[PDB]
Amino acid sequence: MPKRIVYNISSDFQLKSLLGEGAYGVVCSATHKPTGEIVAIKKIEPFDKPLFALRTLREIKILKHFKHENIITIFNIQRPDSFENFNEVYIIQELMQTDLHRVISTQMLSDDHIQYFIYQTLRAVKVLHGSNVIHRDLKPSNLLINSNCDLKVCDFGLARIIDTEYVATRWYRAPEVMLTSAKYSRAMDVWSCGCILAELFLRRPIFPGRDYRHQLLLIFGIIGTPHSDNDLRCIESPRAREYIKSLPMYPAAPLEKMFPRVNPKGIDLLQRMLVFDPAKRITAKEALEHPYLQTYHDPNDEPEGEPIPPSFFEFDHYKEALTTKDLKKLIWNEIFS
Ligand SMILES: Nc1ncnc2c1ncn2[C@@H]1O[C@H](COP(=O)(O)OP(=O)(O)O)[C@@H](O)[C@H]1O
Ligand SMILES: [Mg+2]
DSSP, rough: OOTTTTOOOOOOOEEEEEEOOSSSEEEEEEEEEETTTTEEEEEEEESHHHHHHHHHHHHHHHHHHOTTTTTEEEEEEOOOTTTTOOOEEEEEEEEESEHHHHHHHHHOOHHHHHHHHHHHHHHHHHHHHHEEEOOOOOOOOGEEOTTTEEEEEEOOOOOOOOOOOOOOOGGGHHHHHHSSOOOOOOHHHHHHHHHHHHHHHSSSSSSSOOOHHHHHHHHHHHHOOOHHHHHHHHHOOHHHHHHHSSOOOOOOOOHHHHHTTTOHHHHHHHHHHHOSSSSSSHHHHHTTTTTGGGGTTTTTOOOOOOOOOOGGGGGGOOOSOOOHHHHHHHHHHHHHH
């Protein structure tokens, strides 16, 4: 483990390996000496900028509010010693074996495993959506996987309650999001799920855009360029509609020929997810009922979720901006709840 990685945690924990390292979070596996149980600990420094603190607060509230087989299980959160020296949050969770990005990049998955993985992802999206929560950052690296192929979603800080900012990786973001100030919608998560399913089939990301322009170019190269007014109707900005009209007119690609080895039923489901008009995209519930997933579908074992009021994230609607001191107290009081 790199010496540059410093955790200020209980002596009952012995850090083992670095699992993830970014500008927002750092994740390591650790041995809980007292029990010999190995866990994952996510370290976050949330108070340099408001966006980091907001992301931290949403992540911990969602983690502590949800209980679902396809949502990572949180075990504990370190209790800070003093409000003054409180500058790091440590989230203790169940240790998973790997993540779907690593699996896709290292394994030749069978159609059955692809079905099971997308099924579990959609089952988690169903409960979030039924609770009026959109994830906004679904992608393979945020899907945790165990040896028995159980999949659990993580990284809930970019979530919003449906009623500078961190944004999802461009490769998995819905087109309408990069074309205007689109209203939050469940359809954006479904788009990400479509990108994840396409990636499972292709074994590499399907829309690896180098930038905003390129991303839209790759997307339309596959789903087809919306041409008529009716198609361009979902786009609010007239400037955005004009820009789309300046792109080449691509027809929808023949996926049956683009994926001759893939299960036809899987391609059908994929085409129902990667639709330009967000309103025409299949819902998570409908996707679970799709023939491609009949082996796993169980209408009596797919939690619908319970509505969460927007006030759960009341801070997202503040007029007079929140100070970092305001956010520090909010996170502190959430830890002790
Ligand atoms: N509970 C966990 N068990 C095993 N690995 C994990 C766990 N949580 C995160 N990871 C690893 O750490 C990476 C980053 O974690 P993530 O929670 O997505 O934070 P970030 O906000 O930095 O993306 C994941 O992509 C995964 O490889
Ligand atoms: Mg992540």
